Design an enzyme around this catalytic site. Structure first.
Site, PDB file in Angstrom:
ATOM      1  CD  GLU A 184      -2.573  -1.463   2.578  1.00 21.98           C
ATOM      2  OE1 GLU A 184      -1.904  -1.388   3.635  1.00 21.98           O
ATOM      3  OE2 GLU A 184      -3.810  -1.766   2.503  1.00 21.98           O
ATOM      4  CD  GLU A 378      -7.237  -5.414  -1.695  1.00 21.32           C
ATOM      5  OE1 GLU A 378      -6.773  -5.392  -0.528  1.00 21.32           O
ATOM      6  OE2 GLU A 378      -6.525  -5.573  -2.732  1.00 21.32           O
TER       7      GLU A 378
END
Ligand SMILES: OC[C@H]1O[C@H](O[C@H]2[C@H](O)[C@@H](O)[C@@](O)(O[C@H]3[C@H](O)[C@@H](O)[C@@H](O[C@H]4[C@H](O)[C@@H](O)[C@@H](O)O[C@@H]4CO)O[C@@H]3CO)O[C@@H]2CO)[C@H](O)[C@@H](O)[C@@H]1O
Length: 493
Positions: A184, A378
């Site tokens: 990320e 997600e």
């Protein structure tokens, strides 16, 4: 309403198990995975997601790539009728929530780190986090002559060339460009490896010598050479009101603190932009899209200091949008913003965490749609229940199905964390099949994504660079798009 319903389809992907290719670069259990993938295919899943781990592939030494086990994996995915989201995983597996296998970055890089401890993100106490190379060394040619961005670039080019047949055949729908911890675009502000526990505010991760020097030069140019990095922001498990930095009227709203926070968050914007430049070069002409992952830092969203977002590097306040600049940055790359927390409801979180995942998701998705980019997402945590799936479906189409055409708002896709034995048990999998059906707007699985207006065309060059001031125009607060209180396509279980 069949074809208008097909224009409402949101594809569903499933993450593979961590370690499907092990640390020794062996695809250990193809037979067992085959059986699982064929269950996903029968269930209507569109594709799967996998980490392509840097510390597996480039283990032997610089530019010594071994793609063979991953070729066997891709081959199997193709045989089972699934597409693939391939993560360029430039990070460690092991120290974040859910990580059940240990996969470090390449040992030859760690060896350099033993000589130069400042290649790692560092907190105020001096602890070095070995999970990812600091943004500080992005352009430092200290890795046997290469910079960190050159490493990432070379790796992506080698993947493109060595997987060129799979790419040509349309196996890979997107390249998820890893940009930090857990892939990320963030700082490692909540490291379980150093004792952090939800919902601690986390800590700023800018104390390596490269970032510290960059900051010091910047404050000097601002006319305040004496400014230092925050020294009143507390520790990982503090609450914001216990700190000088994050309390009401505290340092975060002073000129010094605002400068710091701007500087800190800009480092990530520029890190993502520069690495995406290399991803667009590596995949130029290939029928794939690019994507990045943004972490969902929902704790402290409901207080004015947003402390955990701020220590992660997302300079998001009630009067400053810290995510829409990320969306704007993605636009020149034609890239997807893959977000998180799609399953979460605020009522599920403890009161004392001041947690706002619903509103955070609404903000980030809205900002991406406002900036005319694709937004995917997600679930943050494992979930098998209908409440979870209905919340994902809500986020996927927040104003419901359009019976007369494509929906005004829809996510570009959702990736489910994660394939496991538990998912495939009778009841759980039956509920999951209902989730897939509703994501698909009650339509059967659609093999040709052109039919639901998800055709993939050759990746074009990125558009011209956008200066930081134009990126930060997107900090202007905007109203989110309105959300329904519940989906119109509930799983029904
Ligand atoms: O195989 C792909 C990658 O899978 C792992 O990374 C996932 C991560 O497990 C998943 O949570 C998510 O969505 O990342 C963030 C998440 O967005 C944040 O919400 C936060 O999670 C916190 C929970 O929300 C909060 O309620 C509480 O429980 O505490 C959680 C933190 O411990 O942090 C998670 C981690 O950043 O997506 C990533 C990326 O797909 C795996 O670790 C990574 O190595 C794999 O690349």
């Amino acid at each position: 309403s069949d074809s208008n319903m097909l224009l409402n389809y949101v594809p569903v992907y499933v993450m593979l198990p961590l370690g499907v290719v092990n640390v020794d670069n062996v695809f250990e259990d193809p037979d067992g995975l085959k059986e699982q993938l064929l269950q996903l295919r029968a269930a209507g899943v569109d594709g799967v997601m996998v980490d392509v781990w840097w510390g597996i592939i480039e283990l032997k030494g610089p530019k010594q790539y071994d793609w063979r086990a991953y070729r066997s994996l891709l081959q199997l995915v193709q045989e089972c009728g699934l597409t693939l989201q391939a993560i360029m995983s430039f990070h460690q597996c092991g120290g974040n929530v859910g990580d059940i296998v240990n996969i470090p970055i390449p040992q030859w890089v760690l060896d350099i780190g033993e000589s130069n401890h400042d290649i790692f993100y560092t907190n105020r106490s001096g602890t070095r986090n070995k999970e990812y190379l600091t943004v500080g060394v992005d352009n430092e040619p200290i890795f046997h002559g290469r910079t960190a961005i050159e490493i990432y670039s070379d790796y992506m080019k080698s993947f493109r060339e060595n997987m060129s047949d799979f790419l040509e055949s349309g196996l890979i729908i997107d390249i998820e460009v890893g940009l930090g911890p857990a892939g990320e675009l963030r700082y490692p502000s909540y490291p379980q490896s150093q004792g952090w526990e939800f919902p601690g505010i986390g800590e700023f991760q800018c104390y390596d010598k490269y970032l510290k020097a960059d900051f010091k030069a910047a404050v000097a140019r601002a006319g305040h050479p004496e400014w230092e990095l925050p020294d009143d922001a507390g520790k990982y498990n503090d609450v914001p009101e216990s700190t000088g930095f994050f309390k009401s009227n505290g340092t975060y709203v002073t000129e010094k603190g605002k400068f710091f926070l701007t500087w800190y968050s800009n480092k990530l914007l520029n890190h993502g932009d520069q690495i995406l430049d290399e991803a667009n070069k590596a995949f130029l002409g290939c029928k794939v899209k690019l994507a990045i992952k943004v972490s969902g830092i929902h704790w402290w969203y409901k207080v004015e200091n947003h402390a955990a977002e701020l220590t992660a590097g997302y300079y998001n306040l009630n009067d400053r949008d810290g995510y829409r600049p990320i969306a704007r940055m993605l636009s020149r790359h034609h890239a997807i913003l893959n977000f998180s927390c799609l399953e979460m409801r605020d009522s599920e979180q403890p009161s004392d965490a001041k947690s706002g995942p619903q509103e955070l998701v609404q903000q980030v998705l809205s900002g991406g749609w406002r900036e005319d980019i694709r937004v995917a997402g997600e679930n943050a945590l494992p979930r098998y229940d209908a409440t979870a799936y209905n919340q994902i479906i809500l986020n996927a189409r927040p104003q419901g199905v359009n019976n007369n055409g494509p929906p005004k708002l829809s996510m570009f896709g959702v990736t489910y964390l994660r394939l496991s034995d538990d998912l495939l048990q009778k009841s759980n999998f039956n509920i999951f099949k209902k989730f897939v059906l509703k994501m698909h707007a009650d339509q059967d699985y659609c093999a040709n994504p052109q039919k639901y207006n998800h055709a993939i065309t050759p990746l074009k060059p990125s558009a011209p660079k956008i200066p930081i001031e134009v990126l930060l125009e997107a900090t202007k607060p905007t109203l989110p798009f309105p959300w329904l209180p519940e989906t119109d396509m509930k799983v029904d279980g």
